[PDB]
């Protein structure tokens, strides 16, 4: 009996490799001659379903850069509180978290991700925090590999983790390059954070903005100050190099969800960086 | 039974290897160590050994302060393939791994596919292979070779 | 038990050759391949045959037999690739 299942689960992983192969295909084809990443492009229509013997696959692609990249905190800085830290405190505040706790978490994240082992924040802590735990461990002191690594920082819980999850990510870049064309209207608190309004995204053009300058100089952003615009210009984008694939695979009674992070390697070349079984 | 243990073994291996993460780690004292550590004597293996990070822990309530990643390893010890598992990453040296005696086995050899060629050693700090070839000799079965993709198509 | 062990070992060959298809190019996957793999003290013949798909996405069947002429296929696999 176990020979069949093991063969079938193996076959469930191969269908996941099939799912991924299709994703890379769709991405290359829809983005080959395109200079931007927006929601009227073919990759963004989903989900797609394909039959398999004794099952099926369902695939949906999303822009991985449609979120606040926490690894912007890995960026070499030399100011007492960098911009990514300011913006994350503003973001967290907006999830029903008091000013203090929002600061604790953001500063804790900064220290967890920054490569040094020394403290430079009022509330953040390095190895001692983490060696003190029920199961003791060291502070990563590097970019997060997975958004789940944030669960362990000071001042975090399940409720907030799940509130924060749809809005923040862990990409393998230290830049903040948020693709304004692919942000969902539901992720509009990000913009609230970055502007110190679902209206902006609700009224986004069908094929997105041609560039960030066009975004920033629309009537709706008249009264925002120039400094906020100059720094928003360093963190926003109309393009992306990272995508999430969700594949839901069924073989007989076996149901498997796979999340895959895809990187754009060339104009017609996309690759899978890593993948993991995910929650339904 | 001989079959069950082998099926078990292949299951553990497939679940671990196919969800490997390109994540460097801190060792028993906090020293920087590579994402994939592999080669002769890794984890005091009597043959080749390997040690890496993998994801895929499903814990949707996220109730304890823990991520969805684990550190795992394989080695030959006392004439057995053995699986070592730490319950989290960057663990303190006080944190001891579980040990799972798998199939009798006496030599574990590893090759690594970098996207272009098969190579015998792995030395990158951050990067992980596209595929791994494992060979071992089992007294129950003889020589077994298995190829795993670590992260799908490229 | 013997047949379960046989399918299990033939299954490894099939898995191994499916993985290798994902390392090859589109053009290589488009043409039939075959060979021989010695595994657990027996010799297993494998071959990979393209099938025509719906989506403009490749497919391939992977077959494993104890026989050089591929009579009596112990394990088959199907896999999809990008075109
Ligand atoms: Ca620090
Ligand atoms: Ca640090
Ligand atoms: Ca062999
Ligand atoms: Cl083989």
Short mmCIF file of C-alpha atoms and ligand atoms in Angstrom, two decimals:
data_model
loop_
_atom_site.label_atom_id
_atom_site.label_comp_id
_atom_site.label_asym_id
_atom_site.label_seq_id
_atom_site.Cartn_x
_atom_site.Cartn_y
_atom_site.Cartn_z
CA UNK A 1 0.00 0.00 0.00
CA UNK A 2 2.81 2.43 0.86
CA UNK A 3 4.53 1.80 -2.52
CA UNK A 4 1.51 3.26 -4.36
CA UNK A 5 1.22 6.37 -2.13
CA UNK A 6 4.96 7.09 -2.19
CA UNK A 7 4.93 6.76 -6.00
CA UNK A 8 1.84 9.04 -6.06
CA UNK A 9 3.35 11.69 -3.74
CA UNK A 10 6.55 11.53 -5.80
CA UNK A 11 4.16 12.02 -8.73
CA UNK A 12 2.57 14.91 -6.73
CA UNK A 13 6.00 16.59 -6.54
CA UNK A 14 6.51 16.00 -10.28
CA UNK A 15 3.23 17.68 -11.04
CA UNK A 16 4.52 20.53 -8.87
CA UNK A 17 7.60 20.60 -11.10
CA UNK A 18 5.07 20.59 -14.01
CA UNK A 19 3.11 23.43 -12.39
CA UNK A 20 6.35 25.43 -12.00
CA UNK A 21 7.38 24.67 -15.61
CA UNK A 22 4.10 26.19 -16.82
CA UNK A 23 4.51 29.30 -14.60
CA UNK A 24 8.00 29.98 -15.99
CA UNK A 25 6.49 29.50 -19.46
CA UNK A 26 3.64 31.96 -18.90
CA UNK A 27 5.98 34.52 -17.38
CA UNK A 28 8.48 34.38 -20.25
CA UNK A 29 5.75 34.65 -22.86
CA UNK A 30 3.76 37.51 -21.32
CA UNK A 31 6.85 39.56 -20.27
CA UNK A 32 9.26 38.97 -23.20
CA UNK A 33 8.97 42.43 -24.87
CA UNK A 34 7.55 44.23 -21.83
CA UNK A 35 9.46 46.82 -19.77
CA UNK A 36 6.97 46.92 -16.83
CA UNK A 37 4.94 44.57 -14.57
CA UNK A 38 1.21 45.30 -14.29
CA UNK A 39 -2.08 43.50 -13.64
CA UNK A 40 -3.45 43.56 -17.23
CA UNK A 41 -0.59 41.28 -18.34
CA UNK A 42 -1.47 37.56 -19.07
CA UNK A 43 0.51 36.15 -16.07
CA UNK A 44 -1.99 37.88 -13.73
CA UNK A 45 -5.10 35.96 -15.00
CA UNK A 46 -5.91 32.97 -12.81
CA UNK A 47 -6.18 30.44 -11.55
CA UNK A 48 -5.48 28.00 -14.36
CA UNK A 49 -6.52 24.36 -14.06
CA UNK A 50 -5.05 21.32 -15.82
CA UNK A 51 -6.18 17.70 -15.54
CA UNK A 52 -3.73 14.97 -14.56
CA UNK A 53 -4.25 11.21 -14.29
CA UNK A 54 -6.04 10.71 -10.96
CA UNK A 55 -5.93 14.44 -10.18
CA UNK A 56 -5.39 18.06 -11.19
CA UNK A 57 -3.21 21.12 -10.71
CA UNK A 58 -4.38 24.70 -9.97
CA UNK A 59 -1.85 27.51 -10.44
CA UNK A 60 -1.93 31.20 -9.57
CA UNK A 61 0.91 33.71 -10.04
CA UNK A 62 1.35 36.91 -7.98
CA UNK A 63 3.90 39.70 -7.99
CA UNK A 64 6.22 39.05 -5.05
CA UNK A 65 7.19 42.75 -5.09
CA UNK A 66 3.57 43.75 -4.27
CA UNK A 67 4.47 44.02 -0.54
CA UNK A 68 6.82 45.69 1.93
CA UNK A 69 10.19 43.91 1.77
CA UNK A 70 11.53 43.52 5.33
CA UNK A 71 15.00 42.81 3.96
CA UNK A 72 15.23 46.52 3.16
CA UNK A 73 16.38 46.51 6.81
CA UNK A 74 19.53 44.68 5.67
CA UNK A 75 20.50 47.75 3.59
CA UNK A 76 23.79 49.41 4.64
CA UNK A 77 22.76 52.60 6.43
CA UNK A 78 24.37 55.16 8.69
CA UNK A 79 21.41 56.98 10.29
CA UNK A 80 20.03 56.43 13.83
CA UNK A 81 16.73 55.27 12.28
CA UNK A 82 16.73 54.39 8.53
CA UNK A 83 13.67 54.87 6.30
CA UNK A 84 12.62 51.21 6.22
CA UNK A 85 12.42 51.30 10.03
CA UNK A 86 10.32 54.51 10.02
CA UNK A 87 7.97 53.03 7.43
CA UNK A 88 7.56 49.72 9.23
CA UNK A 89 6.68 51.50 12.50
CA UNK A 90 4.08 53.52 10.58
CA UNK A 91 2.79 50.31 8.96
CA UNK A 92 2.59 48.35 12.23
CA UNK A 93 0.89 51.25 14.07
CA UNK A 94 -1.95 51.02 11.57
CA UNK A 95 -2.77 47.40 12.59
CA UNK A 96 -4.18 48.40 16.03
CA UNK A 97 -0.72 48.24 17.71
CA UNK A 98 0.34 50.97 20.21
CA UNK A 99 3.25 53.27 19.24
CA UNK A 100 5.57 51.52 21.72
CA UNK A 101 5.00 47.93 20.58
CA UNK A 102 5.23 48.94 16.90
CA UNK A 103 8.66 50.44 17.68
CA UNK A 104 9.83 47.38 19.67
CA UNK A 105 9.04 45.02 16.81
CA UNK A 106 10.55 47.17 14.05
CA UNK A 107 13.71 47.84 16.03
CA UNK A 108 13.90 44.15 17.02
CA UNK A 109 13.59 43.25 13.33
CA UNK A 110 16.34 45.71 12.46
CA UNK A 111 18.71 44.09 14.98
CA UNK A 112 17.70 40.55 13.97
CA UNK A 113 18.50 41.28 10.27
CA UNK A 114 21.51 43.64 10.64
CA UNK A 115 24.81 41.77 10.37
CA UNK A 116 26.46 43.17 13.50
CA UNK A 117 25.94 41.58 16.92
CA UNK A 118 25.68 44.99 18.66
CA UNK A 119 22.57 46.87 19.73
CA UNK A 120 21.94 50.37 18.33
CA UNK A 121 18.21 50.83 19.14
CA UNK A 122 16.33 51.85 22.30
CA UNK A 123 14.19 48.67 22.34
CA UNK A 124 15.95 46.16 20.02
CA UNK A 125 18.07 43.24 21.24
CA UNK A 126 20.71 40.92 19.74
CA UNK A 127 21.75 37.34 20.77
CA UNK A 128 20.74 37.59 24.46
CA UNK A 129 17.04 37.89 23.62
CA UNK A 130 17.19 34.69 21.57
CA UNK A 131 19.52 32.58 23.71
CA UNK A 132 17.05 33.33 26.58
CA UNK A 133 14.18 31.46 24.86
CA UNK A 134 12.61 28.09 25.72
CA UNK A 135 14.53 26.59 22.80
CA UNK A 136 17.57 28.91 22.63
CA UNK A 137 19.06 30.11 19.33
CA UNK A 138 21.08 32.97 17.78
CA UNK A 139 19.88 36.08 15.92
CA UNK A 140 19.98 35.49 12.15
CA UNK A 141 22.11 38.62 11.54
CA UNK A 142 21.30 38.38 7.82
CA UNK A 143 18.35 38.93 5.46
CA UNK A 144 15.32 36.76 6.31
CA UNK A 145 15.02 33.67 4.15
CA UNK A 146 11.29 33.39 4.74
CA UNK A 147 8.59 35.66 6.09
CA UNK A 148 8.00 33.10 8.92
CA UNK A 149 11.36 34.08 10.48
CA UNK A 150 9.67 37.33 11.59
CA UNK A 151 7.34 35.37 13.91
CA UNK A 152 10.24 35.06 16.43
CA UNK A 153 11.09 38.78 16.88
CA UNK A 154 10.45 40.76 20.06
CA UNK A 155 6.84 41.93 20.53
CA UNK A 156 5.30 39.57 17.95
CA UNK A 157 2.34 37.21 18.34
CA UNK A 158 0.08 35.02 16.16
CA UNK A 159 -2.66 37.67 15.73
CA UNK A 160 -0.26 40.40 14.57
CA UNK A 161 1.81 37.93 12.53
CA UNK A 162 -1.32 37.03 10.57
CA UNK A 163 -2.30 40.70 10.21
CA UNK A 164 1.20 41.58 9.05
CA UNK A 165 1.59 38.60 6.66
CA UNK A 166 -0.46 39.91 3.67
CA UNK A 167 1.57 43.18 3.65
CA UNK A 168 5.23 42.28 4.21
CA UNK A 169 7.64 39.80 2.64
CA UNK A 170 11.22 38.55 2.69
CA UNK A 171 12.82 38.97 -0.76
CA UNK A 172 16.49 38.25 -1.57
CA UNK A 173 17.19 41.97 -2.12
CA UNK A 174 18.02 44.73 0.34
CA UNK A 175 16.19 47.29 -1.81
CA UNK A 176 12.67 48.42 -1.28
CA UNK A 177 11.14 48.20 -4.75
CA UNK A 178 7.39 48.06 -4.24
CA UNK A 179 5.55 47.55 -7.52
CA UNK A 180 2.72 50.10 -7.28
CA UNK A 181 1.04 48.51 -10.35
CA UNK A 182 0.46 45.18 -8.60
CA UNK A 183 -0.39 46.22 -5.00
CA UNK A 184 -3.92 44.96 -4.21
CA UNK A 185 -6.46 47.53 -2.99
CA UNK A 186 -6.58 45.47 0.23
CA UNK A 187 -2.86 46.19 0.81
CA UNK A 188 -3.59 49.94 0.92
CA UNK A 189 -2.29 50.39 4.50
CA UNK A 190 1.19 50.02 2.99
CA UNK A 191 0.64 53.34 1.13
CA UNK A 192 -0.71 54.85 4.40
CA UNK A 193 2.59 53.83 5.98
CA UNK A 194 4.68 55.16 3.10
CA UNK A 195 2.84 58.50 3.11
CA UNK A 196 3.48 59.18 6.86
CA UNK A 197 -6.52 55.76 0.71
CA UNK A 198 -7.61 52.81 -1.31
CA UNK A 199 -8.55 55.73 -3.63
CA UNK A 200 -5.09 55.75 -5.27
CA UNK A 201 -5.15 52.04 -6.12
CA UNK A 202 -8.91 51.90 -6.79
CA UNK A 203 -8.34 54.57 -9.47
CA UNK A 204 -5.10 53.01 -10.84
CA UNK A 205 -5.13 52.89 -14.66
CA UNK A 206 -6.19 49.62 -16.32
CA UNK A 207 -2.62 48.94 -17.54
CA UNK A 208 -0.88 50.56 -14.57
CA UNK A 209 1.40 53.59 -14.41
CA UNK A 210 4.09 54.05 -17.08
CA UNK A 211 6.48 55.03 -14.32
CA UNK A 212 6.70 56.17 -10.68
CA UNK A 213 7.13 59.82 -11.66
CA UNK A 214 3.71 59.53 -13.41
CA UNK A 215 2.31 57.96 -10.26
CA UNK A 216 3.74 60.61 -7.97
CA UNK A 217 2.57 63.58 -10.11
CA UNK A 218 -1.11 62.61 -10.39
CA UNK A 219 -3.68 65.13 -9.07
CA UNK A 220 -4.35 63.07 -5.92
CA UNK A 221 -0.81 63.52 -4.62
CA UNK A 222 -0.71 67.32 -5.04
CA UNK A 223 -0.38 68.24 -1.34
CA UNK A 224 2.15 65.65 -0.25
CA UNK A 225 5.54 67.27 0.30
CA UNK A 226 8.59 66.97 -1.96
CA UNK A 227 10.78 65.14 0.54
CA UNK A 228 8.20 62.40 0.98
CA UNK A 229 8.03 62.15 -2.84
CA UNK A 230 11.84 62.01 -3.22
CA UNK A 231 12.05 59.03 -0.84
CA UNK A 232 8.91 57.35 -2.11
CA UNK A 233 10.73 57.47 -5.50
CA UNK A 234 13.55 55.36 -3.95
CA UNK A 235 11.15 52.70 -2.64
CA UNK A 236 8.45 52.42 -5.32
CA UNK A 237 8.67 50.68 -8.71
CA UNK A 238 6.54 49.84 -11.83
CA UNK A 239 8.48 46.68 -12.52
CA UNK A 240 9.32 43.44 -10.76
CA UNK A 241 11.78 40.61 -10.85
CA UNK A 242 10.13 38.33 -8.27
CA UNK A 243 6.94 36.28 -8.49
CA UNK A 244 5.08 33.88 -6.17
CA UNK A 245 3.64 30.68 -7.60
CA UNK A 246 0.88 28.90 -5.61
CA UNK A 247 0.18 25.39 -6.97
CA UNK A 248 -2.55 23.17 -5.57
CA UNK A 249 -2.02 19.59 -6.60
CA UNK A 250 -4.31 16.57 -6.19
CA UNK A 251 -3.46 12.92 -6.85
CA UNK A 252 -6.19 10.57 -5.71
CA UNK A 253 -6.68 11.49 -2.04
CA UNK A 254 -3.41 13.45 -1.81
CA UNK A 255 -3.71 17.24 -1.68
CA UNK A 256 -0.52 19.31 -1.78
CA UNK A 257 -0.03 23.09 -1.75
CA UNK A 258 3.38 24.35 -3.03
CA UNK A 259 4.64 27.93 -2.85
CA UNK A 260 7.53 28.75 -5.21
CA UNK A 261 9.59 31.96 -5.42
CA UNK A 262 10.53 32.70 -9.01
CA UNK A 263 13.29 35.08 -10.08
CA UNK A 264 13.56 36.79 -13.45
CA UNK A 265 17.03 35.91 -14.82
CA UNK A 266 16.79 37.34 -18.36
CA UNK A 267 14.20 38.87 -20.70
CA UNK A 268 12.87 35.40 -21.56
CA UNK A 269 14.46 33.56 -18.60
CA UNK A 270 12.80 32.88 -15.24
CA UNK A 271 13.96 30.38 -12.56
CA UNK A 272 12.70 28.94 -9.27
CA UNK A 273 14.80 30.10 -6.33
CA UNK A 274 13.24 27.73 -3.78
CA UNK A 275 9.95 26.12 -2.94
CA UNK A 276 8.08 24.85 0.14
CA UNK A 277 4.89 23.07 1.00
CA UNK A 278 2.45 25.83 2.13
CA UNK A 279 -0.79 26.17 4.12
CA UNK A 280 -4.01 25.58 2.18
CA UNK B 1 9.68 -4.17 6.52
CA UNK B 2 13.11 -4.14 4.93
CA UNK B 3 10.91 -2.43 2.32
CA UNK B 4 9.12 -0.22 4.88
CA UNK B 5 12.42 1.07 6.25
CA UNK B 6 13.65 1.85 2.73
CA UNK B 7 10.37 3.55 1.85
CA UNK B 8 10.59 5.56 5.09
CA UNK B 9 14.15 6.51 4.24
CA UNK B 10 13.31 7.71 0.73
CA UNK B 11 10.36 9.62 2.17
CA UNK B 12 12.48 11.50 4.75
CA UNK B 13 15.04 12.31 2.09
CA UNK B 14 12.50 13.55 -0.44
CA UNK B 15 10.64 15.76 2.06
CA UNK B 16 13.92 17.30 3.26
CA UNK B 17 15.90 17.81 0.10
CA UNK B 18 13.08 19.14 -2.11
CA UNK B 19 12.43 22.06 0.27
CA UNK B 20 16.02 23.17 0.85
CA UNK B 21 16.49 26.91 1.50
CA UNK B 22 19.37 29.14 0.36
CA UNK B 23 19.88 30.23 3.95
CA UNK B 24 23.35 30.44 5.63
CA UNK B 25 23.32 29.47 9.31
CA UNK B 26 25.01 30.14 12.61
CA UNK B 27 26.68 27.09 14.20
CA UNK B 28 26.84 25.62 17.71
CA UNK B 29 28.62 28.74 19.02
CA UNK B 30 27.19 31.34 16.59
CA UNK B 31 29.93 30.99 13.95
CA UNK B 32 28.93 31.70 10.33
CA UNK B 33 28.41 28.49 8.33
CA UNK B 34 27.25 27.76 4.73
CA UNK B 35 23.65 27.14 3.63
CA UNK B 36 24.57 23.58 2.50
CA UNK B 37 27.49 21.96 4.29
CA UNK B 38 28.38 18.66 2.54
CA UNK B 39 31.38 16.40 2.24
CA UNK B 40 33.62 13.87 3.94
CA UNK B 41 33.15 13.85 7.69
CA UNK B 42 30.33 16.43 7.75
CA UNK B 43 28.41 15.90 11.11
CA UNK B 44 31.11 13.38 12.03
CA UNK B 45 29.89 11.06 9.26
CA UNK B 46 31.99 7.87 8.68
CA UNK B 47 31.55 8.70 5.01
CA UNK B 48 30.09 11.89 3.46
CA UNK B 49 27.59 13.99 5.39
CA UNK B 50 25.29 16.89 4.73
CA UNK B 51 23.59 19.62 6.70
CA UNK B 52 21.12 22.13 5.44
CA UNK B 53 18.01 24.23 6.12
CA UNK B 54 14.55 23.26 4.78
CA UNK B 55 11.12 24.80 4.94
CA UNK B 56 7.64 23.37 4.68
CA UNK B 57 6.76 23.23 8.36
CA UNK B 58 3.02 23.89 8.35
CA UNK B 59 1.86 25.59 11.53
CA UNK B 60 -1.00 27.83 10.45
CA UNK B 61 -1.89 29.13 13.92
CA UNK B 62 1.75 30.12 14.49
CA UNK B 63 1.21 29.72 18.21
CA UNK B 64 4.80 29.55 19.51
CA UNK B 65 7.56 32.01 18.52
CA UNK B 66 8.91 29.73 15.77
CA UNK B 67 9.54 29.93 12.02
CA UNK B 68 8.59 27.29 9.46
CA UNK B 69 12.23 26.25 8.82
CA UNK B 70 14.27 23.43 10.31
CA UNK B 71 17.88 22.34 10.16
CA UNK B 72 18.46 18.73 9.15
CA UNK B 73 21.36 16.46 8.30
CA UNK B 74 22.34 12.98 7.13
CA UNK B 75 25.43 10.97 7.91
CA UNK B 76 26.73 7.39 8.18
CA UNK B 77 27.13 6.38 11.86
CA UNK B 78 27.58 2.86 13.30
CA UNK B 79 26.84 1.27 9.90
CA UNK B 80 23.52 3.14 9.43
CA UNK B 81 22.24 6.03 7.48
CA UNK B 82 21.07 8.42 10.19
CA UNK B 83 18.90 11.53 10.08
CA UNK B 84 19.55 14.40 12.44
CA UNK B 85 16.91 17.06 13.00
CA UNK B 86 17.09 20.31 14.99
CA UNK B 87 13.68 21.83 15.82
CA UNK B 88 14.71 25.30 14.55
CA UNK B 89 17.55 27.17 12.81
CA UNK B 90 20.70 28.77 14.33
CA UNK B 91 20.15 26.68 17.45
CA UNK B 92 22.24 27.06 20.60
CA UNK B 93 24.80 24.25 21.20
CA UNK B 94 22.64 23.29 24.21
CA UNK B 95 20.02 22.23 21.59
CA UNK B 96 20.55 18.57 20.66
CA UNK B 97 19.28 16.97 17.44
CA UNK B 98 16.91 14.04 17.25
CA UNK B 99 18.52 10.98 15.75
CA UNK B 100 16.74 8.58 13.45
CA UNK B 101 18.49 5.37 12.53
CA UNK B 102 17.45 4.64 8.94
CA UNK B 103 18.73 1.85 6.63
CA UNK B 104 21.94 -0.06 7.20
CA UNK B 105 24.44 1.73 4.95
CA UNK B 106 28.24 2.03 4.81
CA UNK B 107 29.20 4.75 2.31
CA UNK B 108 27.40 7.90 1.30
CA UNK B 109 28.75 9.77 -1.74
CA UNK B 110 27.34 13.12 -2.98
CA UNK B 111 27.44 15.04 -6.23
CA UNK B 112 25.92 18.51 -6.88
CA UNK B 113 24.50 19.99 -10.07
CA UNK B 114 25.10 23.73 -10.30
CA UNK B 115 22.76 24.44 -13.25
CA UNK B 116 25.37 23.50 -15.85
CA UNK B 117 27.54 20.58 -14.64
CA UNK B 118 27.77 17.93 -11.95
CA UNK B 119 30.43 18.67 -9.36
CA UNK B 120 31.83 16.51 -6.58
CA UNK B 121 32.12 19.18 -3.86
CA UNK B 122 29.91 22.09 -2.75
CA UNK B 123 31.57 25.24 -1.41
CA UNK B 124 29.17 28.18 -1.79
CA UNK B 125 28.21 30.11 1.31
CA UNK B 126 24.73 31.28 0.20
CA UNK B 127 23.82 29.32 -2.93
CA UNK B 128 22.32 25.84 -3.03
CA UNK B 129 22.42 23.31 -5.86
CA UNK B 130 19.80 22.74 -8.48
CA UNK B 131 20.08 18.94 -7.97
CA UNK B 132 21.80 16.40 -5.72
CA UNK B 133 22.95 12.89 -6.63
CA UNK B 134 23.32 10.54 -3.69
CA UNK B 135 24.95 7.15 -3.83
CA UNK B 136 25.11 4.74 -0.98
CA UNK B 137 25.93 1.10 -0.45
CA UNK B 138 23.35 -0.91 1.50
CA UNK B 139 23.99 -4.45 2.75
CA UNK B 140 20.27 -5.22 2.21
CA UNK B 141 20.01 -3.87 -1.38
CA UNK B 142 23.52 -3.13 -2.76
CA UNK B 143 24.37 0.16 -4.46
CA UNK B 144 21.55 2.68 -4.67
CA UNK B 145 21.75 5.97 -6.58
CA UNK B 146 19.10 8.71 -6.31
CA UNK B 147 18.80 12.12 -8.01
CA UNK B 148 16.69 14.85 -6.43
CA UNK B 149 15.80 18.28 -7.78
CA UNK B 150 16.13 20.77 -4.95
CA UNK B 151 13.95 23.61 -6.29
CA UNK B 152 12.16 22.57 -9.44
CA UNK B 153 12.92 23.61 -13.02
CA UNK B 154 15.30 26.46 -13.86
CA UNK C 1 6.91 -8.58 -1.59
CA UNK C 2 9.31 -9.40 -4.41
CA UNK C 3 7.08 -7.49 -6.83
CA UNK C 4 6.74 -4.58 -4.41
CA UNK C 5 10.55 -4.56 -4.14
CA UNK C 6 10.87 -4.74 -7.92
CA UNK C 7 8.44 -1.83 -8.51
CA UNK C 8 10.14 0.15 -5.74
CA UNK C 9 13.60 -0.20 -7.32
CA UNK C 10 12.23 0.37 -10.87
CA UNK C 11 10.45 3.37 -9.38
CA UNK C 12 13.83 4.86 -8.33
CA UNK C 13 15.13 4.62 -11.89
CA UNK C 14 11.95 6.32 -13.17
CA UNK C 15 12.31 9.13 -10.61
CA UNK C 16 15.98 9.55 -11.39
CA UNK C 17 15.32 9.84 -15.10
CA UNK C 18 12.43 12.28 -14.57
CA UNK C 19 14.68 14.58 -12.50
CA UNK C 20 17.29 14.48 -15.32
CA UNK C 21 14.66 15.54 -17.87
CA UNK C 22 14.22 18.77 -15.88
CA UNK C 23 17.95 19.46 -16.23
CA UNK C 24 17.90 19.05 -20.05
CA UNK C 25 16.84 21.52 -22.71
CA UNK C 26 13.49 21.67 -24.53
CA UNK C 27 14.92 20.18 -27.74
CA UNK C 28 16.45 17.22 -25.88
CA UNK C 29 13.15 16.45 -24.19
CA UNK C 30 11.48 16.53 -27.62
CA UNK C 31 13.37 13.43 -28.80
CA UNK C 32 13.21 9.88 -27.52
CA UNK C 33 16.00 8.91 -25.14
CA UNK C 34 16.84 5.54 -23.69
CA UNK C 35 19.49 3.84 -21.66
CA UNK C 36 20.49 1.48 -18.92
CA UNK C 37 20.84 1.97 -15.16
CA UNK C 38 22.34 -0.62 -12.79
CA UNK C 39 20.56 -0.43 -9.50
CA UNK C 40 20.43 -2.59 -6.42
CA UNK C 41 22.31 -5.35 -8.31
CA UNK C 42 19.93 -5.51 -11.31
CA UNK C 43 19.90 -3.81 -14.68
CA UNK C 44 17.01 -1.54 -15.60
CA UNK C 45 16.31 -0.16 -19.05
CA UNK C 46 14.62 3.22 -19.33
CA UNK C 47 13.28 5.34 -22.14
CA UNK C 48 11.56 8.71 -22.43
CA UNK C 49 8.94 9.25 -25.15
CA UNK C 50 7.39 12.68 -25.96
CA UNK C 51 3.58 12.95 -26.15
CA UNK C 52 1.69 15.85 -27.72
CA UNK C 53 0.16 18.27 -25.24
CA UNK C 54 -2.71 20.73 -25.52
CA UNK C 55 -0.89 23.83 -24.30
CA UNK C 56 1.83 25.52 -26.38
CA UNK C 57 4.18 23.02 -22.46
CA UNK C 58 5.89 19.68 -23.33
CA UNK C 59 4.98 16.22 -22.02
CA UNK C 60 7.06 13.01 -21.80
CA UNK C 61 6.39 9.42 -20.64
CA UNK C 62 9.20 7.69 -18.70
CA UNK C 63 9.25 3.90 -18.87
CA UNK C 64 11.30 1.38 -16.95
CA UNK C 65 11.59 -2.31 -17.84
CA UNK C 66 13.80 -5.25 -16.90
CA UNK C 67 13.87 -6.00 -20.68
CA UNK C 68 16.18 -4.39 -23.23
CA UNK C 69 13.30 -4.41 -25.78
CA UNK C 70 10.96 -2.76 -23.21
CA UNK C 71 8.35 -5.46 -23.14
CA UNK C 72 6.60 -5.55 -19.75
CA UNK C 73 6.98 -2.04 -18.35
CA UNK C 74 7.42 -2.22 -14.55
CA UNK C 75 7.01 1.53 -13.97
CA UNK C 76 5.71 4.38 -16.16
CA UNK C 77 5.74 8.09 -15.29
CA UNK C 78 4.36 11.16 -17.06
CA UNK C 79 5.84 14.65 -16.68
CA UNK C 80 5.20 18.13 -18.10
CA UNK C 81 7.84 20.74 -19.06
CA UNK C 82 7.85 24.30 -20.57
CA UNK C 83 7.97 24.81 -24.37
CA1 LIG D 1 22.59 45.62 15.37
CA1 LIG D 2 22.22 41.98 14.36
CA1 LIG D 3 24.24 2.20 -10.19
CL1 LIG D 4 18.79 5.61 -12.57
#
